[PDB]
Design a protein around this nucleic acid. Structure first.
Ligand SMILES: [Mg+2]
Ligand SMILES: [Mg+2]
Ligand SMILES: [Mg+2]
Ligand SMILES: [Mg+2]
Ligand SMILES: [Mg+2]
Ligand SMILES: [Mg+2]
Ligand SMILES: [Mg+2]
Ligand SMILES: [Mg+2]
Ligand SMILES: [Mg+2]
Ligand SMILES: [Mg+2]
Ligand SMILES: [Mg+2]
Ligand SMILES: [Mg+2]
Ligand SMILES: [Mg+2]
Ligand SMILES: [Mg+2]
Ligand SMILES: [Mg+2]
Ligand SMILES: [Mg+2]
Ligand SMILES: [Mg+2]
Ligand SMILES: [Mg+2]
Ligand SMILES: [Mg+2]
Ligand SMILES: [Mg+2]
Ligand SMILES: [Mg+2]
Ligand SMILES: [Mg+2]
Ligand SMILES: [Mg+2]
Ligand SMILES: [Mg+2]
Lengths: 263, 50
RNA sequence: UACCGUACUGCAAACCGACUCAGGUGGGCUAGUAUAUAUACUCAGGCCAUAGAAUCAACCAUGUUAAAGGAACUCGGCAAAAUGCACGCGUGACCUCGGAGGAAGCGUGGCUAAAAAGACUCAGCAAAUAGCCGACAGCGACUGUUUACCAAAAACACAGGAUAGUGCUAACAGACGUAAAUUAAGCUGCAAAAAGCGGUUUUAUUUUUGGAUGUAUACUAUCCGACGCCAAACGGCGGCAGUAACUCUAACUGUCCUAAGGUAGCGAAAUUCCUUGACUUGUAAUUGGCGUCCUGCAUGAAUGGCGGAACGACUGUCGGGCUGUCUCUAACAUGGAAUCUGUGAAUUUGAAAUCUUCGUGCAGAUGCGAAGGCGCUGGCAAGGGACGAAGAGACCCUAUGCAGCUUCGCUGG
RNA sequence: GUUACCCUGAUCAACGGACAAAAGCUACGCUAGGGAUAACAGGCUUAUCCGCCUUUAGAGUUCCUAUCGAUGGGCGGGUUUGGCACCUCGAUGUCGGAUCAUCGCGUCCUGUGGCUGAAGGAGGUCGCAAGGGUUGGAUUGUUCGUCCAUUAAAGUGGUACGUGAU
RNA sequence: CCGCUGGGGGCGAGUACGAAAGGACCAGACCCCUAUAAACCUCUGGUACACUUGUUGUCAUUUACACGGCAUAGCAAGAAAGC
């Protein structure tokens, strides 16, 4: 079944034989480097902490890391009409961002990066507040969003920004409205109670094609900063003992907010 | 592969490893210098000159 | 308009290798035939100092040629030989439709011709450079990575898939004796003749390790390793003794301990003792392959079962061509070796003036016994002996022996 | 509580009875020794093996001796499989063939004599004789073995089951 | 003191024998082969690098006549002595 926005690489040689890549014609305005003041150039880490030893394994190498200042709260852009100039594709996240230009009355116009919902066309105007619309890309309080409409970029403690349901093609659903709790189904089929003063970016995150993508060769996934793994049974007993246990911290403070676990 | 040529000379690396200031930067390097003094060595570090 | 560098060397006799060491060492510039920094000859420029001198030793290394054969050699065509190039024709199966493929196989080439053609040569890709081809399997999808100094592979990885954990100050991996420093705004409060010090909430700047300026389509761990066709936690999946009109299988029933006795689809197979498994082909002759069959010592969907295109300095086999690998070696070339001159080590060494045979003997005698032999000393060769030399550790045993690893060995917070 | 006496309590069975408790692996191994302990083989032996007999009952269309040897009894070799651990662990090429050898005869041929159930041929033994001859390669890592087809024949052994300072 | 004299098939014999097919002892000598050993280059071949012929590229060549260098002796063919 050919999806429209995927480049189906022809089997010319092994490696590009079973390779599927996302077309940048579906996202027509990705073209352009990251904005020169919304982005910096930070050194890559390689998986090593401040000591210098490896903490996370199988990481390192690849393209120069560029970091983008994505605004996950939209607190200081409340009540401001922001017209989306273009959509951008960052390699650091599964879902892609959306460049938004805000023109306030007393200040010169500026640009901000926010996560892109499914209904951004590089022409839409986004609005955030108590009185905002129900069209996708609006940030509303959990009280102002309906029951059963998909939402994303959810906060846990108000004023912190959006931390929940923000990967590619993911969304959360509000199913109940307890006065201070508001039971919400997180994308792992887990119900969590999120305070009503928290905010939800209404809509659904883009990059649904993320599941259908296929790096056909080791190099294309190695060039993303992923060094090769090694199986446990391929070693001597000193390195690994080769050749069903729940690991969440029990007696935590967040047991009170969850009704069912990740199903 | 023929061995024996592990010493690849470089003045920057020689001064940056075994120079005076990396010896003084850490406490145990300072006791290394102190026991070089107590032995009586004429050359204290690899980069000393006059 | 100061200070430091400026010699020389820098693919090397001046750097790194104990050496004047056949090794390792970064960047840049460049002429013609000519056309590519490849190839042959040459420009600018550089070099022919670090052992020399003749000659036919044997033998060794590296090559050239070889009549008639041609893998007959050999564990194994190992090693050599052979194809090696641009213009035309052409061009199989199988297949993931891309490939296989430069498939295979056959013509046409220099030289002269202001030119419809020709000359002669044994030879016209004329000297140097530029794939051996085809078929049957096994293993691994592929390109890659791997034991610096005996193993480059079927081992590892790989894209993909499955499972388990992780709701964010996430899990997981680390530092550990515990995180706080400076302002600002608001609400305030105490006695009080017109002002000081406070308490609390919010905010600003720092400081707050990777994962991550990420967040269940994301991160971590384990396993299988593409793709296609029909308890995916450790890991297996039995016996007793009989029942089908001639012998012989045991399909359905009868039994015993027992988590359960191994499906369509597999099998003398990387793995099957009998073994040269009966069966066909293969060769004149086959214990090592290919395709069947069943009698699975000791096979088999996640130790992943069933085969496929392409790929491989992987493994076992068959044809064509090719040739000294061979029948069976010969001549020649270069460089050692042998002669002379000059420079000039080391392994080894109880002392030696060190014969043979038979016997004896700490059990294989140069040295003891009996008999015999031997003018003396060398060069150049061959290595049977001197239990040649080179390591007080190849293997076995022992230690109040060590070391690392493993576990339903013991004890510990 | 201290001390004596009268007594009791381990399959402390590793039974003169380790310090509380208590399993393995090392083809990754390390050290110190041992020819005081094994393997590659030299020494001793000859149970098993191989030759020579002897008794020879019998078979052999008859008849023990053309030819074979059933049962017992021995003599010789150490090239079979074994037994001992005497020699070297201050580590010493064997279980192969490629080249090149030397010796013995229990002779496969060539040279030969007897008995022949001896038509000469073609055979079976038996007696002498070791001069020199014993070739191909296809298959197996095989010194084992066949079977392709040729010769007069396609010998068996000692050779640290000859031979890596070739 | 060393080496040391190998054989096979014919002719002898279609035979003495033998109903008959089936075919010898003698190697005694002659003819062929084949080893092994010892030589020799007369024949036949191989090789032959200061020999002869032909030819390609390139550098020299006040003639791109002849001659010369290098490219495995550049290549290819044919040679005499010696082996
Ligand atoms: Mg190298
Ligand atoms: Mg050194
Ligand atoms: Mg060099
Ligand atoms: Mg050296
Ligand atoms: Mg050098
Ligand atoms: Mg030149
Ligand atoms: Mg010289
Ligand atoms: Mg010929
Ligand atoms: Mg050519
Ligand atoms: Mg490649
Ligand atoms: Mg490869
Ligand atoms: Mg999950
Ligand atoms: Mg010479
Ligand atoms: Mg003796
Ligand atoms: Mg002499
Ligand atoms: Mg000598
Ligand atoms: Mg002990
Ligand atoms: Mg005891
Ligand atoms: Mg104890
Ligand atoms: Mg023995
Ligand atoms: Mg002549
Ligand atoms: Mg001549
Ligand atoms: Mg020249
Ligand atoms: Mg000669």
């Amino acid at each position: 079944a050919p999806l429209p926005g995927l480049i189906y690489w022809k089997p010319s040689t092994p490696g590009t034989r079973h390779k599927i890549s996302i077309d940048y014609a579906g996202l027509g305005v990705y073209t352009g480097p990251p904005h020169p003041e919304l982005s910096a150039h930070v050194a890559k880490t390689g998986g090593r902490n401040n000591t210098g030893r490896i903490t996370t394994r199988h990481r390192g190498g690849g393209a120069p890391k560029v970091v983008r200042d994505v605004d996950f709260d939209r607190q200081r852009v409340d009540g401001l009409p922001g017209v989306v100039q273009r959509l951008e594709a960052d390699p650091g996240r599964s879902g892609w961002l959306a460049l938004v230009k805000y023109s306030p009355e007393g200040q010169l116009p500026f640009y901000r990066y926010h996560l892109a919902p499914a209904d951004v066309k590089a022409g839409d105007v986004l609005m955030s507040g108590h009185g905002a619309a129900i069209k996708p890309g609006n940030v509303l309080t959990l009280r102002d969003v309906p029951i059963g409409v998909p939402i994303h970029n959810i906060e846990l403690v108000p004023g912190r920004g959006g931390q929940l349901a923000r990967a590619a093609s993911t969304s959360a659903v509000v199913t109940s409205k307890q006065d201070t709790h508001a039971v919400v189904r997180l994308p792992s089929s887990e119900t969590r109670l999120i305070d009503l003063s928290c905010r939800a970016t209404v809509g659904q995150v883009s990059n649904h094609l993320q599941r259908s993508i296929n790096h056909g060769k080791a190099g294309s996934r190695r060039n993303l900063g992923w060094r090769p793994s090694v199986r446990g049974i391929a070693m001597n007993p000193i390195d690994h003992p080769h050749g069903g246990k729940r690991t969440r911290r029990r007696d935590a403070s967040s047991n009170k907010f969850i009704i069912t676990r990740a199903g | 592969g023929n061995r024996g040529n592990t010493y690849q000379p470089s003045r920057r690396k020689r001064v940056n490893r075994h120079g005076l200031e990396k010896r003084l930067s850490t406490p145990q390097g300072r006791e290394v210098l102190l026991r070089r003094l107590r032995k009586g060595r004429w050359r204290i570090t690899v980069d000393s000159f006059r």
